[PDB]
Write an enzyme that holds these catalytic residues in place. Structure first.
Site, PDB file in Angstrom:
ATOM      1  N   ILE A  71      41.795 -68.717  77.358  1.00 42.22           N
ATOM      2  CA  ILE A  71      42.589 -69.137  78.569  1.00 42.22           C
ATOM      3  C   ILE A  71      42.750 -70.674  78.632  1.00 42.22           C
ATOM      4  O   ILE A  71      41.771 -71.415  78.508  1.00 42.22           O
ATOM      5  CB  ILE A  71      41.865 -68.628  79.850  1.00 42.22           C
ATOM      6  N   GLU A 160      38.004 -60.705  76.741  1.00 43.18           N
ATOM      7  CA  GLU A 160      36.942 -59.963  76.064  1.00 43.18           C
ATOM      8  C   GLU A 160      37.148 -58.443  75.898  1.00 43.18           C
ATOM      9  O   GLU A 160      36.907 -57.885  74.859  1.00 43.18           O
ATOM     10  CB  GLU A 160      35.552 -60.296  76.630  1.00 43.18           C
ATOM     11  N   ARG A 163      39.615 -57.883  73.116  1.00 40.07           N
ATOM     12  CA  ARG A 163      38.951 -57.988  71.827  1.00 40.07           C
ATOM     13  C   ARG A 163      38.108 -56.767  71.366  1.00 40.07           C
ATOM     14  O   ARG A 163      38.039 -56.492  70.205  1.00 40.07           O
ATOM     15  CB  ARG A 163      38.184 -59.310  71.723  1.00 40.07           C
TER      16      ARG A 163
END
Ligand SMILES: *[C@@H]1O[C@H](CO)[C@@H](O)[C@H](O)[C@H]1NC(C)=O
Length: 246
Positions: A71, A160, A163
């Site tokens: 970010i 996250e 991912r």
């Protein structure tokens, strides 16, 4: 762009947001059936925008670097906020041009500097969908200390989860009750750069990692990852950071 609405959210709609975020990141090849993120992208094309909404419907736009899922900064009504770091300053060249003023946050965007500004580490910060509503509410009005904790919640519940399939499942169970992150969750977040590099190296090494990666599993126990047949590779990691960026 991609979007997510906390009002009416359930495990199925959050899973849909995470699928969208993944499919927004470009690649020209897969390595062991997993998208390889680009070495580089020029111009504004480097940044993805995420539109997030709290239970009450108020919103922020979060700018994300597509080479690495980091970010850079966010827009909250008419104020842009960017991490104090050169990639974010570069990004401020290209995104949230419109804003009336640009605040540089008094920290960069890595987990270690954020935890210091927030006053606690992320093992003690509950996450989940309710926590994401609270995060969006806090970022709406500058409080640099409150914003650090909120940013920790936002990063984990977005980048996250994109991912790792496991992390996405963990947020899904926390759809209606916050809970601090599982031990496996913190572990995967910490290991993403490492896993990406080992998977890329495995091509030309018969699927074998040059260096094994240590992790925590779904039951709270250690595992060690050595090759591409592991379920962390077959059935968990969804995106690879290009070695050109490591
Ligand atoms: C590779 O992966 C599995 C673990 O998923 C393991 O059982 C096996 O012994 C490993 N083999 C090699 C040659 O690295």
């Amino acid at each position: 762009d991609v979007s997510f609405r906390l009002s009416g959210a359930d495990p199925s709609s959050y899973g849909m947001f995470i699928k969208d975020l993944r499919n927004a990141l470009p690649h020209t090849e897969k390595v062991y059936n997993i998208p390889l993120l680009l070495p580089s992208v020029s111009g504004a094309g480097r940044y993805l925008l995420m539109h997030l909404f709290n239970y009450d419907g108020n919103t922020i736009t979060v700018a994300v670097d597509v080479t690495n899922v980091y970010i850079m900064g966010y827009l909250a009504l008419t104020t842009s906020y960017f991490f104090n770091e050169p990639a974010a300053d570069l990004a401020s060249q290209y995104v949230f041009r419109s804003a009336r003023r640009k605040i540089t946050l008094p920290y960069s965007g890595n987990y270690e500097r954020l935890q210091i500004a927030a006053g606690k580490p992320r093992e003690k910060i509950p996450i989940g969908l309710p926590a994401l509503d609270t995060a969006i509410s806090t970022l709406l009005h500058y409080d640099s200390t409150a914003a650090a904790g909120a940013l920790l919640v936002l990063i984990q519940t977005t980048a996250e989860a994109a991912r790792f399939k496991y992390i996405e499942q963990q947020i899904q169970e926390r759809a209606y009750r916050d809970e601090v992150p599982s031990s496996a969750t913190i572990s995967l977040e910490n290991s993403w750069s490492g896993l990406s590099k080992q998977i890329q190296l495995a091509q030309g090494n018969n699927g074998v990692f040059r260096t094994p990666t240590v992790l925590v599993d779904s039951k709270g126990n250690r595992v060690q990852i050595t090759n591409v047949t592991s379920n962390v590779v077959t059935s968990n990691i969804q995106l690879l950071l290009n070695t050109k960026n490591i």
